[PDB]
Amino acid sequence: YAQALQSVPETQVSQLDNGVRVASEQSSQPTCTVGVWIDAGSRYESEKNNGAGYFLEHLAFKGTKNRPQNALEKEVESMGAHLNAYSSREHTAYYIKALSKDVPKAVELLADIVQNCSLEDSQIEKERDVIVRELQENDTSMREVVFNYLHATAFQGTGLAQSVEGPSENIRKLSRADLTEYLSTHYTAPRMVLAAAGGVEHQQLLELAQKHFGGVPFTYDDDAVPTLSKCRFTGSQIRHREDGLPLAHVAIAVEGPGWAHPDLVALQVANAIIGHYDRTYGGGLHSSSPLASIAVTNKLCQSFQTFSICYSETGLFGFYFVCDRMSIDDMMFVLQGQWMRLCTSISESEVLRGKNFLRNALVSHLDGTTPVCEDIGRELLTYGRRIPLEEWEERLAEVDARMVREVCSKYIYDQCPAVAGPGPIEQLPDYNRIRSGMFWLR
Amino acid sequence: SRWLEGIRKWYYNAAGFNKYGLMRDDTIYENDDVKEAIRRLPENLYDDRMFRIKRALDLNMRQQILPKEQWTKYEEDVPYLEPYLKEVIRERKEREEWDK
Amino acid sequence: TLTARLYSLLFRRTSTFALTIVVGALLFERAFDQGADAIYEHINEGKLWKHIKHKYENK
Amino acid sequence: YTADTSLAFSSVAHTCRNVQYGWLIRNLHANGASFFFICIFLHIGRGLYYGSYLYKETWNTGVILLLTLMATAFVGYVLPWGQMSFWGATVITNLFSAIPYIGHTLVEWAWGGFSVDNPTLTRFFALHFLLPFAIAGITIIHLTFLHESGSNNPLGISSDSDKIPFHPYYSFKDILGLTLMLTPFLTLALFSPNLLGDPENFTPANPLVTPPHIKPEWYFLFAYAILRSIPNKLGGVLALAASVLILFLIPFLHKSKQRTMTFRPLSQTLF
Amino acid sequence: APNIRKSHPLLKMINNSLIDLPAPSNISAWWNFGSLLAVCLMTQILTGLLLAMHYTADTSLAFSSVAHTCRNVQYGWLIRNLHANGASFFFICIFLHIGRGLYYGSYL
Amino acid sequence: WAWGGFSVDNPTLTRFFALHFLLPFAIAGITIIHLTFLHESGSNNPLGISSDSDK
Amino acid sequence: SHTDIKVPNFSDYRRPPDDYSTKSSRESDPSRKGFSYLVTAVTTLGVAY
Numbered sequence A: 001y002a003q004a005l006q007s008v009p010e011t012q013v014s015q016l017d018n019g020v021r022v023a024s025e026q027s028s029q030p031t032c033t034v035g036v037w038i039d040a041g042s043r044y045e046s047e048k049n050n051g052a053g054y055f056l057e058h059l060a061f062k063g064t065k066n067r068p069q070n071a072l073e074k075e076v077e078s079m080g081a082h083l084n085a086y087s088s089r090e091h092t093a094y095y096i097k098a099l100s101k102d103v104p105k106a107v108e109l110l111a112d113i114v115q116n117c118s119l120e121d122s123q124i125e126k127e128r129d130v131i132v133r134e135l136q137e138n139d140t141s142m143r144e145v146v147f148n149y150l151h152a153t154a155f156q157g158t159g160l161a162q163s164v165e166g167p168s169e170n171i172r173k174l175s176r177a178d179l180t181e182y183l184s185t186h187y188t189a190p191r192m193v194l195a196a197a198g199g200v201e202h203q204q205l206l207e208l209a210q211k212h213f214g215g216v217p218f219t220y221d222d223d224a225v226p227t228l229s230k231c232r233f234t235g236s237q238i239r240h241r242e243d244g245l246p247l248a249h250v251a252i253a254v255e256g257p258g259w260a261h262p263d264l265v266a267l268q269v270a271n272a273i274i275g276h277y278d279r280t281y282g283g284g285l286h287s288s289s290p291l292a293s294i295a296v297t298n299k300l301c302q303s304f305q306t307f308s309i310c311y312s313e314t315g316l317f318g319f320y321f322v323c324d325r326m327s328i329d330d331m332m333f334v335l336q337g338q339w340m341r342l343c344t345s346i347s348e349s350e351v352l353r354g355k356n357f358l359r360n361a362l363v364s365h366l367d368g369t370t371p372v373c374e375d376i377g378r379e380l381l382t383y384g385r386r387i388p389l390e391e392w393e394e395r396l397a398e399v400d401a402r403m404v405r406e407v408c409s410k411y412i413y414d415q416c417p418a419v420a421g422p423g424p425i426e427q428l429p430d431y432n433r434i435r436s437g438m439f440w441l442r
Numbered sequence B: 001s002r003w004l005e006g007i008r009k010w011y012y013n014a015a016g017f018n019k020y021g022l023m024r025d026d027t028i029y030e031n032d033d034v035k036e037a038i039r040r041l042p043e044n045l046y047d048d049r050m051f052r053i054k055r056a057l058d059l060n061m062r063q064q065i066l067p068k069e070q071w072t073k074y075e076e077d078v079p080y081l082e083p084y085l086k087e088v089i090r091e092r093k094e095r096e097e098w099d100k
Numbered sequence C: 001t002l003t004a005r006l007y008s009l010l011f012r013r014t015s016t017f018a019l020t021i022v023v024g025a026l027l028f029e030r031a032f033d034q035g036a037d038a039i040y041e042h043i044n045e046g047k048l049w050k051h052i053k054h055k056y057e058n059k
Numbered sequence D: 001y002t003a004d005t006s007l008a009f010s011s012v013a014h015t016c017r018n019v020q021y022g023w024l025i026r027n028l029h030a031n032g033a034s035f036f037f038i039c040i041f042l043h044i045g046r047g048l049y050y051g052s053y054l055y056k057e058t059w060n061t062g063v064i065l066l067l068t069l070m071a072t073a074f075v076g077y078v079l080p081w082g083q084m085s086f087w088g089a090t091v092i093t094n095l096f097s098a099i100p101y102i103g104h105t106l107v108e109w110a111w112g113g114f115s116v117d118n119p120t121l122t123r124f125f126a127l128h129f130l131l132p133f134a135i136a137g138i139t140i141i142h143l144t145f146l147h148e149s150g151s152n153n154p155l156g157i158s159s160d161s162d163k164i165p166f167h168p169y170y171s172f173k174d175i176l177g178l179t180l181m182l183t184p185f186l187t188l189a190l191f192s193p194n195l196l197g198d199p200e201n202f203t204p205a206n207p208l209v210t211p212p213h214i215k216p217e218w219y220f221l222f223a224y225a226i227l228r229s230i231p232n233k234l235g236g237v238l239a240l241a242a243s244v245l246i247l248f249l250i251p252f253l254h255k256s257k258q259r260t261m262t263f264r265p266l267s268q269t270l271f
Numbered sequence E: 001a002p003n004i005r006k007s008h009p010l011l012k013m014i015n016n017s018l019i020d021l022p023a024p025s026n027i028s029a030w031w032n033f034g035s036l037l038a039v040c041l042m043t044q045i046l047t048g049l050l051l052a053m054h055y056t057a058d059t060s061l062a063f064s065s066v067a068h069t070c071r072n073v074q075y076g077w078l079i080r081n082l083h084a085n086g087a088s089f090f091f092i093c094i095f096l097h098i099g100r101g102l103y104y105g106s107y108l
Numbered sequence F: 001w002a003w004g005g006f007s008v009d010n011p012t013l014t015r016f017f018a019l020h021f022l023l024p025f026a027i028a029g030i031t032i033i034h035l036t037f038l039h040e041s042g043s044n045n046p047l048g049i050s051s052d053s054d055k
Numbered sequence G: 001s002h003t004d005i006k007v008p009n010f011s012d013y014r015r016p017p018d019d020y021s022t023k024s025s026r027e028s029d030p031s032r033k034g035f036s037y038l039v040t041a042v043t044t045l046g047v048a049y
């Protein structure tokens, strides 16, 4: 095992005279996946700019000036390659998966997109109504509105509070211009990363990129990367009620440290302890995760998930459960009790497993090419370089009990949480109560 | 000589249940009739009233009212339940009668 | 940074809080009495026996 | 305390001069009686004008609470056996005398034998000791019936729309009230102890000296008044009885289509 | 509700403790003491209260206040007796009540 | 301190009388709690085996 | 659509002077809780007396 890790090939990295960082992991696999990952999200938008990046995503594929829609689509389909992508609050990306016999072709396709989207005044107007619709579909997914609302209130009044898709007004009116304005402002080499994994050999990649990414920086701005305005967390709640729904959704959380910070490992290990449930499990005997056990014994919920979603300089460490109108309270009671237990009286027997369960994730985090690429893409972009499983190992292979406590309690104990809840939530006690559910009557 | 219409308007503004933003009908005490009555009320209205009533409890909870602008004007008060409440009461008196 | 020092050291742990509610009480008692008595007695000079005492216990 | 014509008055006095902090305890108890009525009177009020009384059962028991709290406070004031204690007992008790036929025989049995004397101080003391526990008993029933329905509120319209956990909030709220109202109690209790107490009740009871102006404690006056309003001794008692018992009728005299009278300026002045 | 004996906040308390209350069929006669113990209490409190109404609690009047209660207070003698002897009925019962529980493991 | 001051004398007859008058009501109070807890479970029975079979 | 919803402004309106964006709320609140709890700590204290 340790050897298996030790024998895992290093991930080549190198920046251009441009600013783009080109990294990759050579394997053998006849297939592979390459793509660019941008240092851009909704976080970077304005009150009037917000949604661009997304409006933009829906056009990124519909063709370039160098080769219109009918073609781009035809050329990719024709080579059996897959082009897909996404955009969060601080992180966007476009990736392709082909037979590593096409690094050069893929690489070119990529560039041609992150640099020359047609932005056909005629296509735009179409996607405009496609989103407004797609948006009204994202809506009934109470599992997502809830998180949005969480962020909303959690980081109320700041860039983070804005949802990645954006208001209908913005989408109804963004101009062919604004989109261009968003592209030419954030899609710059210094903030972008060209990553890959497969049978591809670094050099052929570099050159190929160094060839199609012919960007040139004049001034110093171009060459530099602007740091964002800090986001203020706020212990608060938001309740979107409607007994009209089948069941309720709840999400509570404290502020997170941020990528850079190490503790995100100990903290990542703690969540592995409370883990997650889901009525399709087979386990009233689930190892620890009493929250799950209890959830089963007393029928506390349909499911729940522990999460340490983080950003550049902040984040959200919390949990979210889906439950029936009548078991909302106990569930919250029992869970919120686990955080305390977590940081007030944890045990080695627990952390031991915690670790293992993580390591197994940590590894399956890299199952395939597309996913690996995702790490290189991210890692660089958010951490600075790449963290080898061999490393993550140690980092989280030396977390003892006392370590979990010290930290969890450092981030959870007597902190003013941020809760959000849509659906039939009459039974969810007031803030004050969930608040004083943040300190154990030790 | 003195319009009941002049009066009614006096009392309306006198009562003051509008400074809280709620219709006349939003104040009728919920005895048996009003209970049946409200249950027949269309959903549009039910939720409308529900919010109003809660927005009023909250003002009252804060010891603060609603800005003059938002005060419901006498002539715009919508008797949303009276029609219903009425049938309920005569439906009942019909039965209170037959059973004799 | 008293307030902050305070929280960290005294008000964070349910244990610590109670413990300073006591030590805090002992000190409050002793100080609050003297002070009150003082204020009281002074507003009444030469009236209390504690004041008239000496005349008959010699003086 | 000692409940005997020959030791009562002084047992109390002794309690004040000899029993450590005895003086304070007596004061608190005496003055407390008033804090009690002032509150019970503001409690009635609130209900009378938020139509809290529409919760009949919880309200009817409340009337029983008032009657009980009275009795216990009438028979409790005799105990110190001072001029008013005695004379008050003799005049107010003798009232039943008006009740035709089975009248005299009641009073004449109520207290000892022929007049407020030892055999009644005892039964009064006993009664005084017992009733308060009955108050507490019933007070439980009161809150039970209450809890059946929610608690009423100022705007008199369904609160379901948004309730709040008692403790986090109201516990704090009430404890605040407790101090805000308990401070005057003590200021009064500690600075003007006798502010509300008849001096004539510092003279050991003496059956050969009827004081001028025999009147029950303030919290009874309003009725003492309505009592001597109608001349015909009989009717007088009835007026008295009705002055309180009318409370049982309040729920049947409610006509407003609205519960409270927040939005009822007219009746508001009437109130 | 129909019954109007199972809906009322107070009757429902009684109809659930002295009626409609599920009791085993084979209950022994030893179970008759809880009952007795309770009525034993009602009795004491009564006779006592009624007896306290003639007592004086003072070194110089106690003994005779009781004596007087017996020689002067109508049916006073009976009341004292019942109260005194009742004290015993009380313990005899409470002792048989313990017993029954000790050997039916009621204490579990 | 229990009794009066230095020996069972007047100051204790009083507090005893008082105590005597008070406690019985506390008995009744608690007696309610007793029956409450009881009622939680059924009533036990001589053969010590589940009575549910027929109450 | 929920995306169309913002949280009103409590800024100034209610927030204590150590709370206005672009500044970590956390550096300033162990101080904020310190005060409150101090007030409570004092009451328990005064009350015991």
Ligand code: HEM
Pocket (backbone or CB within 6 Å): D040, D043, D044, D046, D047, D050, D052, D053, D055, D058, D059, D060, D061, D062, D063, D065, D066, D069, D135, D139, D142, D143, D146, D150, D151, D152, D153, D247
């Ligand atoms: C010593 C006896 C009494 C005590 C301790 C007592 C106690 C209470 C309590 C604990 C409440 C809840 C809080 C509130 O609404 O104020 C209450 C409610 C109530 N009491 Fe009493 N009460 C007493 C006497 C009375 C009297 C005399 C009346 C009747 C004339 C009365 C009428 C009510 C009613 C109607 C409610 C209030 C319902 C509402 O408006 O929400 N109570 N009482």
Ligand code: HEM
Pocket (backbone or CB within 6 Å): E030, E031, E032, E033, E034, E035, E037, E038, E041, E094, E097, E098, E100, E101, E104, E106, E107, F027, F031, F034, F035, F038, F042, F043, F044, F045
């Ligand atoms: C004056 C106080 C007491 C009274 C009035 C009282 C009353 C009762 C009542 C009403 C019952 C129900 C009938 C029965 O099972 O006998 C009961 C049950 C019980 N009491 Fe008591 N009790 C008293 C004292 C005690 C004592 C001293 C004990 C404990 C040592 C005790 C133990 C029990 C238990 C275990 C049950 C019986 C459960 C069973 O076997 O079915 N009780 N009591």
Ligand code: HEM
Pocket (backbone or CB within 6 Å): E041, E044, E045, E047, E048, E049, E050, E051, E052, E053, E055, E066, E080, E083, E084, E087, E090, F020, F021, F022, F023, F024, F025, F027
């Ligand atoms: C729990 C029930 C009670 C028990 C176990 C009990 C037991 C006794 C006992 C042992 C005596 C002595 C009888 C004697 O002189 O030989 C007594 C006396 C007395 N009890 Fe109780 N008692 C009870 C309740 C009460 C209550 C509640 C009152 C009235 C409020 C009361 C008032 C007295 C009085 C005045 C005496 C003195 C008169 C006398 O002893 O004849 N008793 N009681």
